[PDB]
């Protein structure tokens, strides 16, 4: 297979364009001078995530490819936003499919899904990630951070903002290098040498809750807990898993390019065996997907679908396997928020493990027939693509060659898809691989009104972003382990458009100014996932030859339709069609 | 004018109006689809057609009783969208069918403000032709003329006088 | 030749010494514990550029060499100025000479040189630079940036400075992460989920123009277009090219160490064939130098020479090939501002392409006789080294400051050696420095005591000076879908003469505008526009040849004798052709 190296980065609270124009384009522009690169593709998403895939000529040494990529990325790192740099950028040389899933459940229902995920993140994932052959490890859930859930009513009552909160956290959750008594070079006759210990990271919600934000003129104290709820909770809330319908987390493990499948899996089990004796009570490992006695089901809903609606679809999938197929299926491990493609609120995946072969006699109880029957049962689910598969027609990129921009490229894409649909004798299921534009809330900050009021634009933008998007402030120590601190609005003050107006910013003169005084807003459409191909804006189109036609005939026709598109729109073949 | 959100033919109509599927729009209307079904942001099929430039769907919807002055959840109308996005023929059809030329959204913004800001001069002329208040002020006190000065658009300033 | 890794960096508005002392030295101090390294050299230039070259033993694996240099570089990266890190430090493993040049012209005359260079940078370069076997790509021109050309009279009129301009650009040309309505974790039952879109990068001169710098007490607005001209314009203006005397840009392409020339060249042409169909009208590729049928002409004037003077010499060169040699010469692609030396205002190069073998019968019309004749015709051009050659028993000598003597003493020692070597025509021909002479520089002293007494901050002084007279990369914007840079700088006419210094005002803490003349003094002095280092010490490279039928070994033996009489603390080493 051509080896591929993946760069991943994140920007908390960023929309797709923001990610693309501050991160993705910057990396791409700097991926020069790397040997044997066949092509590069990227997605920039409204989850705040970018993935850049660099695919190398067959025969390329994946180690050299990875090192060359990492080194260019290193020279580009100072060009990226500080918020992106501080999340950690990763570079992996991995297969894109899973080798295995390590599930973790709590048999005594002592621990919620969130607890279990933190336990895995904080106690298991690093040692697995260091096991030789392990290319990529996905946590099905999130590590805890310290979560400061801000209340805008209480902030405004005390004439405070998220900026004051972030400032206080950085000042009061600090790890200070303070020197030594009797330090070198010392005076003659010194008797005592001892470290000076000053501020140290906080370790608990109790300690965060008593951060001192201010002292009122009257002498009363405003503590962080007087304007926020303080709790441990995920760095993010996007991925939730279940094992046979019960709360779970786990690790999805991808094989390092060129490593040995069987050796790596055994190294993994051996590492798990070291951890088990120290689990808290109730906690237990399950094995829901070991790579013909397994398969996957993909769930892909339209952009716009929420966590609740993806979950309803996954509940249908899971139910089918635990009822209609309960004689063949041993388990289902289902993940809401991550799928084939990676991360989104509109996607899911179910890993299905079958009973022993010898106990599924009959060709109707073998994987091929089970997957076919499942796809057929799920083919009627509304506004979802749901199918079961183990783990070919064409792979086309439409390309913006002339700075046309997203809206025009979408119109060209639609023109091509309409033309393709008039040739059903030659092309079947010609479709975009990506996502459709969805409504977004465009808010305009009035620079004039802000200046007239003495309200700083940086205080406005921090207030907006930190409250509605979240902001990674600094690190703390949870039960001995370095983890993140995040500030964000408590959920109920960031749900609806009118909530924008309840957030106040402090002017230079000390007055509190509501957001409504200096902003206006409207609905518009934009992209939840912007694609690029060899550094240019792109839209991936999949399809296949119609029955009784060669792939090459299907491709020749696509090329002909492509030659009639608006000026500045090109194309290229990738993946299986390269 | 704030139409409530939810149904199966309504949803198909919202999607068809958005994608420009003229035939399907026609079929759905004949099968009783609510012409003013709204999505979660208050957009009706007329909003969608106007935003995305689908003239013939705009005409079909109005002929079947679409609320020409439908408001989204921030007070914006199909005329706002068509004026903002440069859809001249749509602007004319809407105003011809009783669109409120001086409708203000929640920010006090009118269709003339939007057309002015993007420099869509033929739209500006048509709106003024239909009675647009040339001196209407948004929440910040700004007129179309103030917009033309801030943007440095001399042609627009000329039209406004 | 042995494999070389090159580190390049850039510091806009920096003089040679600033580059050397804040970038070059800091990097060089980490270049040890690298396997198979023979030697290291560097140039730090008053163009704000550094290039360090690390040369490895024959047979060294260039991938490993590049990795090891880079790994040492990473130690210096956080110590480098932010202005340098943000330009993108490069580490390349290329041949030092060009494989080919791709030229670009517009046959309709509807694009300027500047427009063409932007098109090439924005639509063509990156794909070529990612092509396997491409070691280094040199743009002959500059990508557009958004140029804010400030007017100091208008700034002072509104009590503003370049610091206020830069601040406002950062605030109002911004790309804001603003979260979501209804995002996770939601209130359960939430149906609305939408990204919040707040400020986004500006895309046009119109949008930059309307940046709001301040609201007067009377309510009137000062916009950026009230204090600056705003246009698209090069990141820099130092490299200008022509093709048969018409406006052009291009890409000079060097081969990656060990890559196949035929295969790489073909992959380049396949990439260019993908681009061609999307060209705007009139744009066309030409091929002015394919590596014989070609040669180059180096043009090197003395330091101090302006763009206009280098252009005159380049015109004389181009004029010669298009008139005297018109039956042999198919094309000339001339570049003002870039030469064998690298980048500089006193340097240029011409790439010449000959007509087919079969339309030049006679030994007098073959490359060697053509270059010989050209070199002869150019030999009498005054104050310029101009020669023509395609692509031996010279020597390559490094005089080294081994005792902290400093630049001025090193130059005195160099001159001493050169004078001595001149009195030996019997063994040594044409002993000369490879570098540049010192030139006048404007030394300005900021009076700290006056600055403090007036309440004018040192950072504001330094930003006003540097941004106005040097240019400052503020942040990025999006031009027709592509991330590009934004620069602030004085409009040309306010940064041309010494007296202009005093028309720039800085705002004090109490709001008073203070001219630069109140807290500064200046004088003329000399300094170097190009500081050289060899194995991490200050150096001066000296070239020459063995006299007719003397061995290079005998010539070198003499230079070693002459070098042993120089002042204490001056040493030497052999590099390049002389190293083995």
SS3 for C347-396, per residue?
A: EEEEEEEECCHHHCCCHHHCHHHHHHHHHHHHCCCCCCEEEEECCCCEEE
The span from the CA of A247 to the CA of C228, in Å, is 61
Chains in touch with A (≥3 Cβ pairs < 8 A): B, C
Cβ atoms of residues C99 and C264 within 8 Å: yes
Q: Strand C428-433 vs strand C537-546: parallel, antiparallel, or unpaired? A: antiparallel
Cβ neighbourhood burial of A542 (10 Å; 0-12, 13-18, 19+)? middle
Do B152 and C225 make contact, defined as CB atoms within 8 angstroms? yes
The CATH topology of domain C98-143+235-292 is Alpha-Beta Plaits (3.30.70)
User: Contacts of residue C484 in chain A, CB cutoff 8 Å?
Assistant: none
Exposure string (b/e) for A477-500, b if CB count within 10 Å is 16 or more? bbeeeebbbbbbbbbebbbebebb
Q: For A107-159, where are the E strands, in sequence order?
A: 134-139, 144-150
Cα atoms in the 13 Å half-sphere on the side-chain side of A116: 30
**Which CATH architecture fits A1-97?**
2-Layer Sandwich (3.30)
Strand partners, C41: C53, C534
In this complex, which chains have at least 3 CB pairs below 8 Å with chain B?
A, C
| C465 three-state secondary structure | helix
Residues of B whose CB is below 8 A from C191: 40
Are A148 and A488 spatial neighbours (Cβ–Cβ below 8 Å)? yes
CB C564 within 8 A of CB C417: no
Q: Which of C127, C133, C198 sits opposite A464 (nearest CB)?
A: C198
Segment holding C285, helix H or strand E: strand C283-290
Q: Return left, alpha or beta for B141; rule: phi > 0 is left, psi -120 to 50 is alpha, else beta.
A: left
Q: What is the DSSP letter of C334?
A: E
As its CATH architecture, domain B1-161 has Alpha Horseshoe (1.25)
Nearest-CB residue to A14 (from C74, C129, C177): C177
Tell me the angle at which helices B55-63 and B88-96 cross, rounded to the nearest 10 degrees: 10
Can you give the length of chain B in residues? 161
Instruction: Give me the helices (H) in A304-429, please.
Output: 307-323, 367-378, 406-421
| Alpha-carbon span A570 to A562, nearest angstrom | 7
The yes-or-no answer to whether A98-143+235-292 and A293-391 have a common fold is yes
- Residues of C within 8 A of B40 (CB-CB) are 191-192
Contact A91, A62 (CB under 8 A): no
Closest residue by Cα to residue C335 from C311, C358, C360, C300:
C311
In whole angstroms, what is the distance from residue C3 CA to residue C1 CA? 7
**Would you give the DSSP letter of residue C21?**
I
Judging contacts by C-beta atoms under 8 Å, the chain A residues touching residue C482 are: 25, 403
Contact C213, C223 (CB under 8 A): yes
Q: Which fold has domain C392-437+529-580?
A: Alpha-Beta Plaits (3.30.70)
Distance CA B109, CA B147 (A): 12
In this structure, are residues C299 and C314 in contact, taking their beta carbons and an 8 Å threshold?
A: yes
Residues B114 and A98: their CA atoms lie apart, in Å, by 51
Tell me the H-state helices in C146-210. 152-157, 162-172, 205-209
User: Residue A86 to residues A11, A562, C453, C472: CA-CA distances in angstroms?
Assistant: 9, 42, 41, 26
Task: Report d(CA B117, CA A418) in Å as an integer.
Answer: 34
Name the strand (E) or helix (H) holding B56.
Answer: helix B55-63
- Coil/strand/helix, residue A573: strand
Q: How far apart are the first and last CA of chain A?
A: 12
Two tokens at A466? 């930190």
Beta-ladder partners of C506:
C514
Contacts of A358 (CB under 8 A, 6+ apart): none
A495 and C74: CB-CB below 8 Å? no
Helix (H, G, I), strand (E, B), or coil: what is residue C309?
helix
Contact B49, B93 (CB under 8 A): no
Q: What are the E-state strand segments in A406-518? A: 427-432, 438-445, 471-478, 481-489, 504-506, 512-514
Angle between helices C162-172 and C458-470 (to 10 degrees): 80
- Closest by Cα among C373, C316, C323 to C350: C316
Q: Neighbours of C (≥3 Cβ pairs closer than 8 A)? A: A, B
Query: Domain A293-391 is in which class?
Result: alpha beta
Q: Which residue of C has its CA nearest to B150?
A: C210
- Among the partner-chain residues A37, A40, A443, the one whose CB lies closest to the CB of C198 is A443
Decide if C190 touches B, using CB distance below 8 A.
no
Residues B152, C192: C-beta atoms closer than 8 Å: no
What does chain A come to in residues?
A: 578
- The highest-level CATH class for domain A392-436+528-578 is alpha beta
The DSSP code for B94 is H
| Rounded distance between C-alpha atoms, residue C258 and residue A36, angstroms | 13
Q: What is the CA radius of gyration of chain C?
A: 27
Domain spans, chain A: 1-97, 98-143+235-292, 144-234+437-527, 293-391, 392-436+528-578
Residue whose tokens read 């790192």: A77
Q: Which approach determined this entry?
A: X-ray
| Contact call for residues C428 and C505 (beta carbons, < 8 A) | no
Q: What is the resolution of this structure in A?
A: 1.9
As a whole number of Å, the CA-based R_g of chain A is 27
The answer to whether B107 contacts A523, with C-beta atoms less than 8 Å apart, is no
Instruction: Calculate the dihedral angle through the C-alpha atoms of C306, C307, C313, C318, rounding to the nearest 10 degrees.
Output: 180
Q: Measure Cα distances from C536 to A95, C186, C395, C402, C577 in Å.
A: 44, 59, 21, 10, 20
A188 close to B (CB below 8 A): no
Question: If 0-12 CB within 10 Å is exposed, 13-18 middle and 19+ buried, where does residue A405 land?
Answer: middle
Rounded to whole angstroms, the Cα distance separating C352 from C331 reads 6
How far is residue A459's CA from residue A436's CA, in Å, rounded to a whole number? 33
The DSSP bridge partners found for residue A396 are A541, A573
> What is the greatest pairwise CA distance in chain A?
97
Rounded to the nearest 5 percent, the helix, strand and coil shares of chain C are 35, 35, 30
* CB-based contact A354:A329 (threshold 8 Å): yes
Domain extents for chain B? 1-161
Are A164 and A156 contacting, i.e. CB atoms less than 8 angstroms apart?
no
For residues C17-41, one letter each, b for 16 or more C-beta atoms within 10 angstroms of the residue's C-beta and e for the rest, the string is bebbebbbbbbbebbeebebbbbbb
Residue C112, token pair as written in the block: 């300027």
Q: Detail the DSSP E strand segments found in A235-328.
A: 240-243, 246-256, 283-290, 294-300
CB C242 within 8 A of CB C71: no
Closest CA to A3 of A45, A51, A56: A56
Closest CA to C533 of C77, C93, C44: C44
DSSP per position, C385-450? EEEEE----EEEEEEEE-SS--HHHHHHHHHHHHHHHHT-TTTEEEEEESS---EEEEEEEE-HHH
Element (H, E) at B154: helix B154-160
């Amino acid at each position: 297979a051509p080896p591929a190296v993946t760069i991943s980065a994140s920007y908390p609270g960023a929309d797709a364009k923001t990610v693309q124009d501050t991160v993705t384009q910057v990396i791409e522009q700097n991926m020069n001078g790397i040997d044997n690169l066949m092509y590069m593709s990227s997605n920039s998403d409204s989850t705040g995530t970018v993935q850049i895939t660099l695919t190398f000529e067959s025969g390329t040494d994946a180690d050299i490819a990875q090192v060359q990529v990492q080194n260019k990325l290193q020279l580009a790192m100072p060009l990226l936003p500080q918020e992106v740099q501080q999340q950690g950028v990763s570079v992996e040389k991995s297969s894109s499919s899973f080798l295995m899933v390590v599930g973790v459940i709590n048999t005594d229902g002592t621990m919620t899904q969130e607890d279990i995920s933190d336990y895995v993140a904080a106690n298991m994932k690093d040692a697995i990630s260091r096991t030789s052959g392990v290319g990529d490890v996905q946590l099905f859930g999130s590590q805890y951070a310290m979560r400061i859930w801000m209340n805008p009513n209480e902030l405004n009552k005390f004439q405070l903002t998220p900026v004051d909160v972030i400032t206080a956290i950085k000042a009061q959750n600090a790890q200070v290098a303070a020197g030594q008594l009797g330090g070198t070079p010392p005076v003659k006759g010194q008797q005592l040498n001892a470290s000076i210990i000053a501020q140290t990271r906080l370790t608990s919600t109790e300690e965060f809750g008593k951060i001192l934000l201010k002292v009122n003129q009257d002498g009363s104290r405003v503590l962080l807990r007087d304007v926020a709820k303080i709790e441990l909770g995920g760095e993010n809330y996007d991925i939730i898993a279940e094992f046979n319908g019960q709360p779970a987390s786990g690790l999805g493990i991808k094989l390092a390019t060129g490593a040995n499948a069987l050796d790596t899996a055994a190294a993994i089990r051996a590492e798990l065996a070291k951890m088990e004796p120290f689990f808290p009570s109730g906690l237990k490992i399950v094995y829901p997907y070991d790579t013909q006695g397994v398969f996957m089901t993909m769930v892909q809903l339209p952009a716009g679908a929420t966590q609740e609606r993806t979950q309803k679809v996954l509940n249908e999938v899971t139910h089918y396997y635990l009822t209609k197929e309960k004689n063949n299926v041993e388990s289902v491990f289902a993940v809401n928020g991550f799928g084939f493609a990676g991360r989104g609120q509109n996607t899911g995946i179910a890993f299905v493990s079958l009973k022993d072969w010898a106990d599924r006699p009959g060709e109707e109880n073998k994987v091929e027939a089970i997957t076919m029957r499942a796809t057929r049962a799920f083919s009627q689910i509304k506004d979802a693509m749901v199918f079961a598969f183990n783990l070919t027609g064409f792979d086309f990129e439409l390309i913006d060659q002339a700075g046309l921009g997203h809206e025009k490229l979408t119109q060209a894409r639609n023109q091509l898809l309409a033309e393709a649909a008039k040739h059903p004798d030659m092309l079947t299921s010609v479709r975009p691989n990506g996502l459709e534009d969805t409504p977004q809330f465009k808010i305009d900050i009035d620079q004039e009104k802000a200046q007239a009021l003495g309200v700083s634009i940086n205080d406005i933008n921090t207030t907006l972003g930190a409250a509605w998007g979240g902001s990674y402030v600094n690190d703390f120590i949870d039960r001995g382990r370095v983890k993140k601190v995040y500030v964000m609005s408590e959920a109920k003050y960031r749900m609806l458009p009118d909530d924008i107006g309840d957030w106040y910013v402090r002017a230079a003169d000390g007055q509190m100014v509501p957001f409504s005084a200096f902003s206006s807003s409207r609905w518009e459409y934009g992209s939840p996932r912007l694609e690029r191909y060899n550094g240019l804006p792109s839209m991936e189109i999949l399809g296949q030859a119609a029955p009784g036609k060669s792939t090459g005939e299907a491709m020749e026709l696509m090329e002909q339709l492509a030659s009639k598109l608006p000026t500045g729109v090109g194309y290229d073949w990738t993946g299986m069609s390269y | 004018h704030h139409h409530h959100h939810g149904s199966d033919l309504g949803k198909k109509l919202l999607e068809a109006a958005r994608a420009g599927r003229d035939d399907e729009v026609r079929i759905l209307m004949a099968n009783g689809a609510d012409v003013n079904a709204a999505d979660v942001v208050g957009w009706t099929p007329l909003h969608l057609a106007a935003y995305w430039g689908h003239l013939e769907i705009v005409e079909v919807l109005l002929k079947n009783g679409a609320d020409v002055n439908a408001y989204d959840t921030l007070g914006s109308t199909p005329l706002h969208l068509a004026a903002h996005f440069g859809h001249l023929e749509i602007v004319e059809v809407l105003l011809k069918n009783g669109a409120d030329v001086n409708a203000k959204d929640d920010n006090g913004i009118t269709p003339l403000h939007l057309a002015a800001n993007r420099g869509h001069l033929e739209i500006v002329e048509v709106l003024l032709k239909y009675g647009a208040d040339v001196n209407a002020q948004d929440k910040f006190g700004k007129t179309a003329f103030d917009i033309s000065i801030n943007n440095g658009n001399e042609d627009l300033a000329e039209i406004l006088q």
